[PDB]
Amino acid sequence: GTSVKPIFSRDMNEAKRRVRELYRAWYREVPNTVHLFQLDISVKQGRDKVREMFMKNAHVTDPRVVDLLVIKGKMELEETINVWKQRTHIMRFFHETEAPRPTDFLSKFYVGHDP
Amino acid sequence: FAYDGLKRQRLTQPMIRNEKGLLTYTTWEDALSRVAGMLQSFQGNDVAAIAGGLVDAEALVALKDLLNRVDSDSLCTEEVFPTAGAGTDLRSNYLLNTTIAGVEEADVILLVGTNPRFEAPLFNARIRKSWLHNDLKVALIGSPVD
Amino acid sequence: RGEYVVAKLDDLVNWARRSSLWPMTFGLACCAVEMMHMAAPRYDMDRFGVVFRASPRQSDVMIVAGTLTNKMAPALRKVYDQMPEPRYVVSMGSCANGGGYYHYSYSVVRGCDRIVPVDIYVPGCPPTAEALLYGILQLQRKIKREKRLRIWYRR
Amino acid sequence: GVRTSPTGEKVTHTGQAYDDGDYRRVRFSDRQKEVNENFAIDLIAEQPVSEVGSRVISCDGGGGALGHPRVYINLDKETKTGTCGYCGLQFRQPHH
Amino acid sequence: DTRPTIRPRNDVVHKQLSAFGQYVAEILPKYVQQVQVSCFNELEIFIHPDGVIPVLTFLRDHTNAQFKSLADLTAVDVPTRQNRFEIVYNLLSLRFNSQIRVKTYTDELTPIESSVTVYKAANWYEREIWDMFGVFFANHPDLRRILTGYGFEGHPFRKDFPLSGYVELRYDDEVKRVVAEPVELAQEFRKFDLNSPWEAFPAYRQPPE
Amino acid sequence: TYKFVNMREPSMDMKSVTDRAAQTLLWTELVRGLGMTLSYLFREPATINYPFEKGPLSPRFRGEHALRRYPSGEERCIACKLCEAVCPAQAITIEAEPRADGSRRTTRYDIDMTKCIYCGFCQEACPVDAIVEGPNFEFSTETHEELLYNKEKLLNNGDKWEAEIAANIQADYLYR
Amino acid sequence: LHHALIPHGKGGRSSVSGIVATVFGATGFLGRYVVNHLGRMGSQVIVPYRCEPYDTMHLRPMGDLGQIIFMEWNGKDKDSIRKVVEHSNVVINLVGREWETKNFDFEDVFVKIPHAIAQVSKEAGVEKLIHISHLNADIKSPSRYLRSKAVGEKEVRAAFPEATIIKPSDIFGREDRFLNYFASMRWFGGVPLISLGKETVKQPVYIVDVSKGIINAIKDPDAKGKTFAFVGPNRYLLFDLVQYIFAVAYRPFLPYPLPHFAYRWVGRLFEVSPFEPWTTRDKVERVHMSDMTLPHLPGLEDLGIQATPLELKAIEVLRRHRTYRWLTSEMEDVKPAKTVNI
Amino acid sequence: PTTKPPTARKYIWTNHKFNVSGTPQQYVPYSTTRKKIQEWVPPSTPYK
Ligand SMILES: NC(=O)C1=CN([C@@H]2O[C@H](COP(=O)(O)OP(=O)(O)OC[C@H]3O[C@@H](n4cnc5c(N)ncnc54)[C@H](OP(=O)(O)O)[C@@H]3O)[C@@H](O)[C@H]2O)C=CC1
Ligand code: SF4
Ligand code: SF4
Ligand code: SF4
Ligand SMILES: [Zn+2]
């Protein structure tokens, strides 16, 4: 049960090692993608956003899972730099069209009967 | 057949009294604002609650603490259990300690002040089944009800 | 008076616009081959005065014909954008109309009108070739009942 | 036949009726509220009541293959005249 | 056939395929866990995840097999199995006009080394099994998305993925660009529970468990 | 059996190569094409004059749906609810209700033309031939709303095309 | 609230919010965006229209089917307004022409029809009204625009006591006729700003800010009778926008002062065109007019919206006016204009 | 039909109509059912 297959990394140490340089690539690209995709957002909000999706799953301990998001996250940086994706495909991450969802208990209660 | 009752005279919106003192539909804001001011200004026995016939244990607990958060302990219900003696203290006093599923093996049952034909029809079904097979002796005091 | 003169001028523009539109069928699915079928000598759009024209900067009416997916969604809109005015889109088939047979799938936007302002909705799965030919006829009848110059006169 | 609502609004056979405000009514503005003038309930009620002297009569509904699944409705109830479920037209036995 | 309604069977192919099943069975008792020939003359080779190259390379170059045609490979997401995925290759032999099916089990995380070397037809046949299901294929040229939308999230063919998905598009005129929102349908799917409560054909009935 | 499609044996006699040189120099095979299309022009066309004449159809044609009624006139529909259960696109929505007479038919028969796919399964599903789908195909429109047919719309259309579909199922129910 | 107007859904396209808008003259710049915001949570708008339906074709894909109805309506006719406002929870007014017309004058488009729609809406039984005016609407202002706005403003306020009033300072966006108007000056040589435009201050407002501010006002129960005014986060001198938007468009900046009377002469000359005039005397002196700083009137911050900076959402609009030599140039090259703090 | 007249019915549309789309006698969809959840009717006159 505990003994299992190393898809790409034995230990969580080399898991971050795969996260590191991929973040470096996912850090370097921002000025060029923002340039040729012809957006309006600034580079810095692109930079701190890259942090944002690097954050939500920064809580798993299984080495296979984390490096599975490594290849998962490896799979859009080229989908962007070879202009395969669209402007609608990277503004999608910049969730903008929806009104701010409710955070306080009062706001949920006012809106409707749904947790 | 009670689902139709779900669709009759359904309370839908915050119903509060108008300038005359007549119920009208308004947003939530005024509804809980009205309760908030009156509950905070008053304090003690002057605030209390009356339970209904069908209330979840969730809401009962929800304002059991709320009534205590405003220092009130009179959390009353429709049906009356004599508080003399253990009352609400000992669970057995108001509990089917034998369990409905465990009435079949009983031999002589003494029903007191009830008409299980209409009080608990399903329980009356269970005792009837055990009456037919287990051959128990039923005994009810009070009105000669079927 | 000026109303009569502008009415004639509007009709003069009206007659050509309802007889010289060049559709661009954005071939998507089985609905598209039907539009090629009403290109066959059996129906022959060109006898009405319309020609299948690519380079949608030349076309006037553009026909979505088949299911429309999210992958196809953003590009299809851009085709509508640099499509010069006057521009009209005709919904070919149930899938382009309201998602049709795939209305509940995860990858097709229910109805093409969610992306572009559909002018004529043509029902069918697929709409038989002459049913679309009917829809094109309805387009010219609707084109006949416009008041572009008349509205500007009262503007 | 067809009746009319207080807002005119010819009420369909089902009984639909938009009330006074009912913002949804605005869709009928500049348009017409499509209602079928023929109402099934009173368009069959006036149909002649069949008089067949038997206990059980088939009710295929005319053109057996083209009609509706043939039933074998009973004719012994003298209080009311027994009708086919699908057909709706009424069979009664003359003095049974 | 004295009973034209029922489909006639063919035992001649049936036991010949059964003979070939044992044939491959004895060669690789380290890989072939299970061999099964069904009623309709279909042969199944249940293999271990490690065996995607050897048995397929065996089935492709052997003189008595000559199965070089990759018909298809597909996954069958079965939640109740500990190995949810079931990659099912299909092989066709021109020389013996027969069909061979091989199955390998997998979790979400356990990888399958790519069979591109064995069947180079399989190049594009993982780019969607990775898309639809999410089973990653090791040492493979490219694992790109070709069925799901660009940057789409999830593996839709997974049986835990909803029919309608999560994102619905619409052209937003505020930003002059189509954008995604949480899905909300005009009508919800009127699901039907059409499984009869009375037992079907007792031939494949499950044993008392 | 089989046959080869490109095994060609160009004879290398002085005769044959003359034709090959004649073929290349004088565009003989290209002239074959010109005379081929010229013969096509000298033929009649087959462009039907729509709408003054329309395509040839068949009694089994599947078109726009229309609920019918008995010769008495009461709606054939009895809300058996088969059609939506087989409807491959779930375009049929319906809720039955008690009626005053007791012949409790439906208060709702709403078929979404932009979801329906015109398989004709509804006809085969209906045991009383209530929902048939008529020969009309001109029911195009300009707004998506008018394709969400409702119980009233089907009933009106059934009363419209009643003259046509009655003969269609009359001449086709033996096949069915 | 009526049973059919109880809000539902997660605020999506096919969700129902119970708000029944009747936006007037939405076939324009800001009317486009409010409807787009109106269809966000599925509020059935009526959007009466007077132009050709083709010009109204682009408003369909902002709401579910049957959520965006279209009704023909004429301003001069009386029953035309009533036929679209009987069943409206709210009524939104946005009618306004920025130039003189033969059949409609500034007075007719700013006191005649807003009072008429307000009085029928109160007569019909509407619950709210959002009549928009200009932040610069002064009864004795030199511009015919602002004085006409002012007289109508007291007219609708008197006609409808509870009519919430919106007065945005100046609207800048994709087709604002404000930023593109300045960019269009390139075709006529240098910029004809009077006295180098060194004596005029404006505070522009983004569309998303004001358009949202409408439906926060709609959902706010305390907005009845208020007079909200919407201003941007920073003010700028007139000469402070011109070179900035020229620089962000990378066009050759050529300021050129000239007398105001000749500036009026140019405005009149452009008015003689039978089609839509490029500029008119009204906007001639409206540009050089400087907005107030009144803080007593509640702002968009009161409802809970922050006013986005002019420099932040500018690349979206001014990118169009750039040439091929600057179509890919970012806004890092340009710098924010010299804001005049309050 | 001149030689095979269609069968006559009481409900068959006596006057056939063309398509009515884009015209004031258009079709407009509307729910044919009846509202099922009805509100609790507020009583009138007294207070406490
Ligand atoms: N910076 C700015 O421009 C600001 C403007 N405002 C005010 O906002 C209002 C609308 O602005 P905006 O939407 O950008 O303007 P647009 O010119 O883009 O649109 C104006 C709208 O008014 C309609 N309209 C005008 N006159 C009539 C009439 N006589 N009868 C019927 N409809 C009529 C137009 O119809 P159609 O499309 O057919 O012409 C159009 O829908 C105006 O009053 C304006 O002064 C407020 C603050 C700032
Ligand atoms: S509407 Fe029918 S025929 Fe047309 S693309 Fe969809 S499924 Fe195919
Ligand atoms: S033809 Fe009938 S059964 Fe088939 S999708 Fe259409 S309505 Fe449903
Ligand atoms: S139309 Fe026919 S199949 Fe559909 S519900 Fe009615 S009786 Fe049943
Ligand atoms: Zn019958």
GROMACS .gro file of C-alpha atoms in nm, chain G residues 11 27 47 80 117 131 143 158 185 199 202 215 246 254 268 320:
model
   16
  908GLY     CA    1  -2.688   3.582  -1.073
  924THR     CA    2  -2.891   5.193  -2.850
  944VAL     CA    3  -3.526   4.861  -2.423
  977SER     CA    4  -4.559   5.502  -2.688
 1014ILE     CA    5  -4.159   5.927  -1.924
 1028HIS     CA    6  -3.282   5.973  -1.477
 1040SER     CA    7  -2.364   7.554  -2.288
 1055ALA     CA    8  -4.061   6.754  -0.933
 1082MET     CA    9  -0.810   6.586  -3.427
 1096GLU     CA   10  -0.740   7.656  -1.798
 1099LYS     CA   11  -1.207   6.741  -1.603
 1112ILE     CA   12  -2.771   4.869  -1.071
 1143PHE     CA   13  -0.181   6.157  -2.788
 1151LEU     CA   14   0.085   6.929  -3.204
 1165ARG     CA   15  -2.066   7.621  -3.668
 1217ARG     CA   16  -0.733   5.148  -3.199
   0.00000   0.00000   0.00000
